[PDB]
Ligand binder design. Structure first.
Ligand code: CLA
Ligand code: CLA
Ligand code: CLA
Ligand code: CLA
Ligand code: CLA
Ligand code: CLA
Ligand code: CLA
Ligand SMILES: CCCCCCCCCCCC(=O)OC\C(C#C[C@@]12O[C@]1(C)C[C@@H](O)CC2(C)C)=C/C=C/C(C)=C/C=C/C=C(C)/C=C/C=C(\C)C=C=C1C(C)(C)C[C@H](OC(C)=O)C[C@@]1(C)O
Ligand SMILES: CCCCCC(=O)OC\C(C=C=C1C(C)(C)C[C@H](OC(C)=O)C[C@@]1(C)O)=C/C=C/C(C)=C/C=C/C=C(C)/C=C/C=C(\C)C(=O)C[C@@]12O[C@]1(C)C[C@@H](O)CC2(C)C
Ligand SMILES: CC1=C(C#C/C(C)=C/C=C/C(C)=C/C=C/C=C(C)/C=C/C=C(C)/C=C/[C@@]23O[C@]2(C)C[C@@H](O)CC3(C)C)C(C)(C)C[C@H](O)C1
Lengths: 158, 33, 197, 156, 172, 143
């Protein structure tokens, strides 16, 4: 069991390389959760586009997820860049405040619970489900993009 | 090859050195007892 | 709590809840789900009446933007969900900018608060004379309008099913057996806002 | 000045038929005065803008005079976004003024701190009357520009 | 140490001068620059993209064109310079930015400099991502840079090619 | 009426309560800027000042610089903005060194810790704002 800084959601004390200082634990959890959420969305989008979902229009059809990035970068991905940056700025405010001071704001808790699903009695299970799905989706998206980069794109990527 | 020394030394000396000297001199001016 | 409304006959007089959903959150989640269900129902009933008007060729005796040249006559010549693609480009802006105004007012200006915290879901009666510009319910008793709200919910669910069937039949042929083939219901099967985006 | 509010001009006095201000909270009066003053200021800006842009439009070149055509023939989308951003900034400041516990309704100058005379009420009434006149004038100008296709200094 | 602390108290307060922080940072920079030297050796090997025969015209680069002895600055030196400028901009953002996840470049308010000393910094028993081992690696990297500079200066060969003697068939 | 009165009810302080100094509009503007907004750590104040300033500073170098009529105009403007941002950061650090010495620190801006946090926030925000305006200027045909 590496140090006493562990003891939260999704902790099996797996740290062989020892990349966990007493300070770099909250930032580590925040980075892991951000990567996991972006990987869940990325894998779902890659699979759904390669499965048959298309934006209605002749431009966005006849395009797989592999060759979509260099076509819509200057026109359609720019809007996504603007919106993602707009959200990431307020995220940066909260993250930097949490990093220097502010003894609240657990890593990942952006307050984006509009429906207020944390009032359910299954909220800790929601926490570990989010973390497990984030890890599985980071592995899944890395698998999908590295397999589709090696020739065989298709749907199943093998 | 001695054709690089003007373009290396002249900016380094003329810009970087007196800027650091001005900052250091100002700090040494305003330190008190 | 799953006492609420919408539980009656032809479902066992108990909550129809295979998947959790109702217990996915708390009381406020149920209020949000009920407001979504009621708003969805009302939109589906309105869409069904508008679609029935469109099929029977009941259009306004006007012009609809003489500058563009579109008229009410050739908005009924095309099928459903293609008429929305032909409503110029300012008309979609105006229909939209009217509808967020109603949404923002229907959530914000509640003397009791949002439906999740104080106030029943599906109640924009604080917008004065919005639901009832004439009287219609003005002398109805509370026990009557409770049953009327129950009928509202049931008809909304049926209208949701019907408009899903209409969209499927216009999109994927042979989906709805009674619809099967039709002279109308020929089009894209969906409408994007502002036509293409 | 009735109920602590300026107004009440000579040609027609306390102009409240239909009873909009009978038995109403001071918050409702503040909201009504804010609406009236903001309408008046927007309409004075609108009337002066159509009048000036009918004959003096040097900012882009040849740019027509039918006012609904003015907003669409050019004024690229960045310009409309910048106008909307400016107006949204001023409206956010209006909200922040409305949350203060010294809120005279249409007041951004915060004149409760300074001493006021009836000349101040007279100038407030001048602003209100000019605002109402520009309300009617702006609606009329937009209606003419739709019906005929000409601006205010045109059509004559 | 105390000689330099008494000689330059303002400079030794912030950890500048012959301190352990300075030597650790210089060792890290020597490690990354060894990686950069190897990468530029691969760059001349494969010819990934930059060509170092063409010139930089005035009409596209201003006074940062012809500068030394009315001699042209080449595209290879310009490309490596642009990469170095971007590295320096990231460096300035890290030095003058929020002190997150990082050892600070300078010493903060009244904190004492660390001391893993030196001498031989025992490699056995300090394996992994330990400060003593990283310290040893940076020290060896600085000595490698000094040795390569001296060997290239004595032999009259290219600094990127004086290490090509000690590799054999590698990259370029 | 009288719209110019003694400032803060003191007739002998060297200021006046004009409609420019003590209006509610000016208080709302200059009480909600990052340097004056309530409940802000000095790092966030510096960050919010810095991004606007970097956006600003990459403004004039690209259009009016010596390499304006060059294919490398925007890159040179970005580098010039980076250099000016570095100079301003150095000036902020030396001002903090000369002004705040032997201070207790804390969340106050007028201290060593507060000014170091403010300078760090300004530097990272200024570099970020210059980069963001570079990205927006490189794809200006999108708007
Ligand atoms: C990490 C998240 C992520 C990212 C970066 C992308 C990126 C992309 N998607 Mg995508 N997608 C995602 C998640 C994501 N997706 C998810 C979760 C779904 C399922 C709900 C989809 C469903 C989807 C479809 C159906 C299509 C795309 C398309 C595209 C491409 C066009 C960009 C565009 O117009 O979108 C801009 C989006 C917004 C501005 C919405 C902001 C919210 C682009 C490569 C299109 C394409 O070109 O495919 C070839 C397309 O047809 N995506
Ligand atoms: C006092 C005498 C003196 C003066 C006025 C200059 C003037 C100049 N030299 Mg220079 N130089 C000198 C002596 C001097 N040199 C000596 C003795 C050497 C042999 C080491 C050199 C070697 C040299 C090189 C290799 C280069 C220059 C270059 C230059 C030019 C750009 C400035 C620069 O980067 O200098 C940098 C100079 C140095 C790093 C060497 C130190 C110069 C002397 C030793 C310092 C004397 C200080 C003096 C007494 C003033 C004291 C007060 C001062 C602190 C304010 C400038 C015309 C550059 C050039 O040609 O540009 C076109 C260039 O590349 N110099
Ligand atoms: C989901 C709701 C919905 C939507 C999106 C539409 C969409 C449309 N309707 Mg429509 N309509 C609806 C409900 C709806 N309708 C209902 C409930 C009725 C019965 C009153 C009608 C009666 C109707 C007529 C008589 C006409 C349209 C027409 C049109 C088209 C032109 C837009 C227009 O003039 O709007 C007008 C829309 C309304 C007046 C409906 C307002 C309903 C709200 C609840 C207030 C009552 C457009 C495709 C015109 C056309 O060319 O179609 C062929 C036309 O002449 N509609
Ligand atoms: C929408 C704009 C608007 C609003 C919010 C107000 C609000 C107010 N006015 Mg006011 N006024 C307006 C426009 C407006 N006015 C115009 C245009 C004129 C010129 C005729 C006047 C002339 C006027 C006088 C002379 C006096 C007031 C007074 C008042 C205050 C108390 C009366 C009251 O309760 O009105 C509440 C008003 C509303 C709730 C707005 C009703 C909007 C209806 C729905 C409009 C219906 C259509 C309309 C009849 C015709 C427009 C269409 C036409 C272009 C074809 C109150 C703050 C009195 C005052 O200041 O007391 C101290 C007073 O003496 N007003
Ligand atoms: C190109 C090679 C290179 C690079 C990138 C650096 C980079 C650095 N050196 Mg360094 N240094 C170098 C060569 C280099 N050095 C050489 C050849 C020597 C002579 C032996 C030194 C002697 C030296 C000292 C004595 C100190 C630095 C320090 C520093 C750091 C801050 C410098 C500063 O204030 O900016 C301007 C920085 C990481 C300082 C440091 O890290 O303090 C914490 C410090 O005290 N350096
Ligand atoms: C500019 C880089 C730099 C700096 C600031 C230091 C700093 C230090 N070294 Mg060091 N060292 C360096 C490069 C550097 N080293 C390199 C490249 C080597 C390899 C030859 C060594 C080999 C070395 C040994 C063998 C020893 C030091 C020691 C020391 C310490 C006191 C002596 C001193 O000032 O040496 C400058 C001090 C922490 C001594 C120590 O451990 O004292 C604490 C000691 O015994 N160093
Ligand atoms: C004598 C020393 C010296 C040197 C070497 C330079 C060098 C330069 N000046 Mg400059 N200048 C100086 C003194 C000097 N200046 C003085 C004393 C004045 C006041 C009279 C000026 C006023 C001045 C103006 C008004 C302008 C220049 C410009 C330029 C650039 C020429 C245009 C070009 O090709 O690059 C184009 C520029 C780039 C490719 C960007 C390079 C990125 C920066 C400069 C590198 C970072 C340097 C770093 C921050 C230094 C830190 C110093 C600090 C430690 C104290 C070049 C970087 C022009 C310029 O910068 O273009 C925008 C310009 O417009 N200069
Ligand atoms: C001026 C106007 C003044 C009057 C205003 C006004 O009209 O009031 C509007 C109003 C009102 C009112 C009152 O207030 C009034 C006026 C007075 C007051 O005292 C009483 C009340 C009531 C409060 C009510 C509105 C009710 C509505 C809109 C109900 C709409 C309801 C749509 C449905 C059920 C859709 C159904 C779809 C179906 C059946 C589609 C389908 C199917 C399937 C289901 C898929 C199954 C099958 O598929 C297969 C097997 O193949 C066959 C198929 C294809 O057919
Ligand atoms: C449009 C902005 C409206 C501002 C907002 C507003 O006032 O809201 C009111 C509103 C909706 C709403 C709501 C209510 C339900 C009523 C109330 C809710 O209350 C709450 C709190 O919930 C809020 C809201 C928003 O939900 C909608 C108002 C819509 C409005 C006022 C729409 C004007 C169109 C004029 C056109 C299309 C002219 C075309 C002119 C065209 C196309 C021309 O070609 C002109 C032409 O010259 C050209 C260019 C060349 C010439 O040669 C030829 C001619 C002369 C022909
Ligand atoms: C003990 C003592 C004495 C002594 C002594 C001695 C022998 C002192 C010796 C000191 C010595 C020998 C100090 C070497 C430093 C080497 C450095 C800093 C290398 C940095 C190199 C760095 C930081 C990396 C740079 C680059 O990576 C960059 C950034 C980009 C790359 O593209 C290029 C490279 C890789 C180059 C005296 C004289 C007897 C007097 C008194 O008694 C005290």
């Amino acid at each position: 069991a590496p140090e006493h800084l562990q003891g939260m959601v999704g902790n099996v004390d797996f740290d062989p390389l020892g990349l966990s200082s007493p300070n770099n634990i909250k930032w580590m959890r925040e980075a892991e959760l951000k990567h996991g959420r972006m990987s869940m969305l990325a894998w779902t989008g890659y699979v759904a586009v390669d499965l048959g979902l298309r934006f209605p229009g002749a431009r966005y059809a006849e395009l797989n997820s592999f060759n979509a990035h260099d076509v819509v970068a200057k026109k359609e991905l720019f809007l996504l860049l603007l919106w993602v940056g707009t959200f990431e700025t307020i995220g940066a405010s909260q993250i930097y405040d949490m990093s220097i001071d502010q003894s609240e704001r657990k890593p990942g808790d952006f307050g984006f619970d509009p429906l207020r699903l944390l009032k359910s009695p299954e909220a800790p299970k929601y926490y570990e489900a989010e973390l497990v799905h984030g890890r599985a989706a980071m592995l899944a998206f890395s698998a999908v993009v590295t397999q589709s980069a090696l020739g065989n794109t298709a749907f199943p990527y093998f | 090859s001695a054709s690089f020394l003007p373009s290396i030394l002249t900016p380094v000396v003329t810009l970087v050195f007196p800027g650091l000297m001005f900052a250091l001199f100002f700090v040494l001016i305003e330190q008190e007892e | 709590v799953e006492t609420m409304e919408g539980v009656g006959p032809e479902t066992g007089n108990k909550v129809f809840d295979p998947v959790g959903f109702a217990t996915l959150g708390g009381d406020e989640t149920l209020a949000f789900f009920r407001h979504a269900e009621i708003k969805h129902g009302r939109v589906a009933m309105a869409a069904m009446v508008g679609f029935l008007f469109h099929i029977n060729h009941i259009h306004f005796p006007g012009y609809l933007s003489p500058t563009a040249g579109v008229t009410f006559e050739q908005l009924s010549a095309v099928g459903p969900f293609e008429a929305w693609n032909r409503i110029p480009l300012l008309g979609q802006w105006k229909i939209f900018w009217t509808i967020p105004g109603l949404e923002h007012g229907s959530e914000c200006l509640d003397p009791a608060g949002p439906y999740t915290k104080g106030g029943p879901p599906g109640n924009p009666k604080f917008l004065k004379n919005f639901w009832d510009p004439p009287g219609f319910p003005k002398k109805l008793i509370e026990a009557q309008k409770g049953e009327k709200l129950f009928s509202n919910l049931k008809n909304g669910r049926l209208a949701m099913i019907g408009i899903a069937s209409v969209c499927a039949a216009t999109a994927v042929p042979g989906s709805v057996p009674l619809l099967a083939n039709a002279p109308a219901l020929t089009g894209p099967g969906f409408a994007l806002p502002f036509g293409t985006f | 000045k009735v109920n602590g509010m300026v107004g009440d001009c000579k040609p027609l006095g306390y102009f409240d038929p239909l009873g909009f201000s009978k038995d109403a909270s001071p918050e409702t009066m503040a909201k009504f005065r804010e609406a009236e003053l903001k309408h008046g200021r927007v309409a004075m800006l609108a009337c002066a803008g159509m009048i000036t842009a009918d004959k003096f439009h040097p900012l882009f070149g040849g740019k027509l005079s039918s006012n609904p055509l003015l907003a669409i023939t050019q004024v690229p989308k960045l310009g409309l976004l910048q106008i909307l951003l400016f107006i949204g900034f001023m409206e956010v400041f209006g909200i922040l003024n409305s949350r203060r516990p010294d809120y005279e309704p249409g007041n951004f100058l915060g004149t409760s701190q300074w001493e006021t005379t009836p000349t101040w009420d007279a100038y407030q009434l001048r602003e209100l009357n000019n605002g109402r006149l520009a309300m009617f004038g702006a609606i009329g100008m937009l209606t003419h520009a739709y019906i005929t296709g000409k601006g205010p200094l045109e059509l004559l | 140490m105390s000689q330099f602390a008494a000689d330059y108290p303002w400079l030794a307060k912030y950890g500048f001068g012959p301190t352990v922080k300075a030597e650790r940072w210089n060792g890290r920079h020597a490690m990354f620059g060894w990686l950069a030297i190897l990468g530029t050796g691969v760059a001349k090997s494969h010819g990934w993209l930059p060509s170092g025969d063409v010139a930089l015209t005035y009409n596209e680069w201003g006074g940062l064109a012809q500068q030394g002895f009315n001699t042209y600055i080449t595209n290879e030196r310009a490309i490596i310079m642009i990469a170095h400028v971007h590295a320096l901009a990231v460096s300035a953002a890290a030095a003058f930015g929020p002190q997150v996840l990082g050892d600070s470049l300078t010493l903060l308010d009244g904190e004492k400099d660390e001391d893993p000393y030196g001498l031989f910094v025992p490699l056995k028993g300090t394996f992994g991502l330990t400060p003593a081992a990283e310290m040893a690696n940076g020290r060896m990297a600085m000595m490698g840079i000094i040795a390569v500079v001296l060997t290239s200066a004595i032999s009259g060969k290219d600094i990127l090619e004086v290490v090509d003697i000690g590799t054999g068939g590698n990259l370029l | 009426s009288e719209f110019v009165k003694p400032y803060n009810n003191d007739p002998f302080v060297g200021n006046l309560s004009t409609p420019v100094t003590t209006s509610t509009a000016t208080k709302l503007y200059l009480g909600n800027l990052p340097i004056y907004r309530k409940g802000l750590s000095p790092l966030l104040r510096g960050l919010e000042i810095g991004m606007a300033h970097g956006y600003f500073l990459i403004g004039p170098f690209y259009i009016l610089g010596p390499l304006r009529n060059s294919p490398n105009a925007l890159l040179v403007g970005l580098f010039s903005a980076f250099g000016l941002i570095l100079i301003l950061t150095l000036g902020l650090t030396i001002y903090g060194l000369a002004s705040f010495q032997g201070t207790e620190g804390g969340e106050n801006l007028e201290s060593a810790k507060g000014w170091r946090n403010f300078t760090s926030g300004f530097s990272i925000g200024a570099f970020g704002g210059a980069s963001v305006a570079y990205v927006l200027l490189d794809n200006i045909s999108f708007f």
